[PDB]
Amino acid sequence: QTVDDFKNLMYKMQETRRAIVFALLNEKDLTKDDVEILKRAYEKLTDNFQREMCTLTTKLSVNIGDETRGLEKDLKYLDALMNIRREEPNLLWPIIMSRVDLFSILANYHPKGKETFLKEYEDTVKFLKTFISSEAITGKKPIFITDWDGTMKDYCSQYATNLQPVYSAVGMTRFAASFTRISAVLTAGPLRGPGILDLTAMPIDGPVMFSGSWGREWWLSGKRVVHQDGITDEGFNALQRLDDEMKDLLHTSPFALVGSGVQRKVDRLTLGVQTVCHHVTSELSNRYQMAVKERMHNSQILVFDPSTELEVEVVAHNSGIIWNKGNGVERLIKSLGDSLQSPGKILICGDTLSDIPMVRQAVKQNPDGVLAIFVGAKMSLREEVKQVIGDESRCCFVSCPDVIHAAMSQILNEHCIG
Amino acid sequence: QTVDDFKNLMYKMQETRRAIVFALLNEKDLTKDDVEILKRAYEKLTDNFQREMCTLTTKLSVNIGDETRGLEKDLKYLDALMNIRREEPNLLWPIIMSRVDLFSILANYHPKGKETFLKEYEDTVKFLKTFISSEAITGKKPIFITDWDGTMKDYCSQYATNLQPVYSAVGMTRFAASFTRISAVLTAGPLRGPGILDLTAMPIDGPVMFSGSWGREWWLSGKRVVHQDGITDEGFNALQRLDDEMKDLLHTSPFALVGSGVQRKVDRLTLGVQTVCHHVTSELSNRYQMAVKERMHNSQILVFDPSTELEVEVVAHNSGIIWNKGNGVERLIKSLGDSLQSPGKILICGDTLSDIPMVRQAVKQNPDGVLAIFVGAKMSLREEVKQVIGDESRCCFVSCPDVIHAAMSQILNEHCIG
Ligand SMILES: [Mg+2]
Ligand SMILES: [Mg+2]
């Protein structure tokens, strides 16, 4: 009913999710109790419409649509898996997954209809096949680089509970391990506390490398690599002090379930102070922002930024090069000892304009060469993608990530299973 | 209190606005009654918080913030003008306007503060000076091309009442006439019924040329020029028939005060069926969309498109080149007999990604050359602008159109008045 109960529930069913994913990727038995956890988590969100979590001072109405849909699709997926597992006990998990009709499960969620879902699915499948064919030509597996939010994961009203489902995790991990030599994930949010590593349900130390702050931080191999480059050592740590001055403010009753909800990015802090249209009062937001301004201790190398009506930022800087996802990709590839210039295909997935640099860099290195899949892109963005790349023919546009997921599952069913 | 009362009130005070603008641009006396109209229009919107207009079936809560701010700023501006007019009866209007401290009037509306407003103002002024200096170098006045919504005009919750204030109209007209040889306005919405020509408070047949449908239609000189290019004659007129099948649906009680609110664009119809977050019920929207689907009479060259959760489109096509604002600029300049290649500076103003083509085309013709001012642009968009153009130094970023307006007013005060 309250905030911490919701958060703890979601996080529990999420670590349970990771356990399930590990069990499905390492030929381990599927615990019916672990599934029961997700089942209870789903039943809890559907009883009292949406749900409203309250504390001892204020009350917030929270949109749990994404969490509910994720839990639902996961329940259907797992139910199927167990249904074929029971009928044939000692089959390998990929074979059982090859017998799952994921298409029928995901098609009912396409906002434009199943008919469009089918065509987008087929085109995405052929596109992906073109991407996979790179190995048979060059001898080495191609490189896959994607965005998270809106690209591989449906948009969530809260970043704090933007939890990745099981089927997508399994699909992405299998696809990355089987068909790619490099798979990278570039996000704007942090790695942890809460970050992409906490929201994901994937091996993390597997075939997929996760990043944060547009590539300024990475998780590999067992440690965290942070690229300051522009930010000073005093600009840094001061952000840490401010973060300490925020985490205790969250413990009072100011909340972090508003959009982004105070994120600690390598070079800045991004707090969500207001929700569209007007969740949370117009006054509490002002008290919030003023309290944030107070905890900025001159000045002291920390610059305040009102930014928008919904978000607010506290940045270090100013010496630097204005970091973007392109820099993250470049630095990663340079660090790994690989190259984008090497003859072979490159698949890049995105949903917003901030993903265009990733493409840019790629077509600067391999203009043969680059394949792009964009999710829910407006006309202008689609044209921009068509502009950065030559083709046109090398461009693929879908409406939702589930198209990509289903396509990948089909590719796995065809090439890894037969 | 109702819908039509609101619409008629706004339109009346808008034609009154045009009358006032004409009076201020042609050395005519300023009718105190015409000002009184705006005064009553302002008082009517501030009495009962926001306002809710209802009909005989449903009730809608309407955000009239933009209209109220426009009316308010207009009232202050006109009050000043009359205050110096009374103190010196037979002065020329530009001189009186040169004595108006518009900066103090507009600075209180900057969401980031007056301090930022000042710096953005100064930088924009110097930038504009650089733009004006082109005439003294090349002998001919430079070319100015801008976007409307979000660029020269604050965002409005309803396109039907997105009314341009007086001071901005005066400023833009004076600036365009005095410093430019070509001034163009590219919008996505139609020209009329309701269109940009109805929402503007500018001479229309003056120094500024207005367009619609990303340049597919233009108003010059006294007639409307429509570029089909891709759309067939049967694809056209069918859109007109559907439009006829919509305008009568609006007369029932389905409304067009939702965002865009059914727009007749040269190649398509863009209806606003849902508001963020959830103004209007979730069922009435469905009835709306289904009724729209019904009035599509095979099929019959009209393609339906769910697009987003808020908007919906009915497109003709498919043969064409996918028209953008760049094509509008190109076709306009080619039609007028001028050229972007000719040595001289080019100022381009925008707020979204759809304005990037305008820049693109320009830097394809004049890479010396192009100056860009972007309003309320996110980091990614700013970087994209910095990418399309070489400089960097030739880029100017502001937070609100009022910065541009105040800057232009200052330029007028310095060069046209002394
Ligand atoms: Mg993204
Ligand atoms: Mg615009």
Swiss-Prot record, chains A, B:
Task performed by this protein: Catalyzes the hydrolysis of trehalose 6-phosphate to trehalose and phosphate; prevents the accumulation of toxic levels of trehalose 6-phosphate.
Keywords, in A-Z order: Hydrolase, Magnesium, Metal-binding
UniProt cofactor note: Binds 1 Mg(2+) ion per subunit.
Catalytic activities: alpha,alpha-trehalose 6-phosphate + H2O = alpha,alpha-trehalose + phosphate
MF terms (GO), sorted A to Z: magnesium ion binding; trehalose-phosphatase activity
Effect of D267A: Strongly reduces catalytic activity
Source organism: Brugia malayi
Mutation effect (S260A): Reduces catalytic activity
GO BP annotation list: carbohydrate derivative catabolic process; dephosphorylation; trehalose biosynthetic process
Annotated active site: D149
Effect of K265A: Strongly reduces catalytic activity
One Pfam family recorded for the sequence: T6PP_C
UniProt key word Magnesium: yes
Gene3D superfamilies membership: 1.20.58.1800, 3.30.70.3080, HAD superfamily/HAD-like
Protein name in UniProt: Trehalose-phosphatase
Family statement: Belongs to the gob-1 trehalose phosphatase family.
Matches recorded under SUPFAM superfamilies: HAD-like
Regulation: Inhibited by trehalose 6-sulfate.
Cofactor: Mg(2+)
Binding positions for substrate per the UniProt entry: Q263, R264, K265
KW Hydrolase (keyword) present: yes
Positions bound to Mg(2+): D147, D149, D351
Top-level taxonomic group: Eukaryota
EC class (word): hydrolase
Enzyme Commission (EC) number: 3.1.3.12
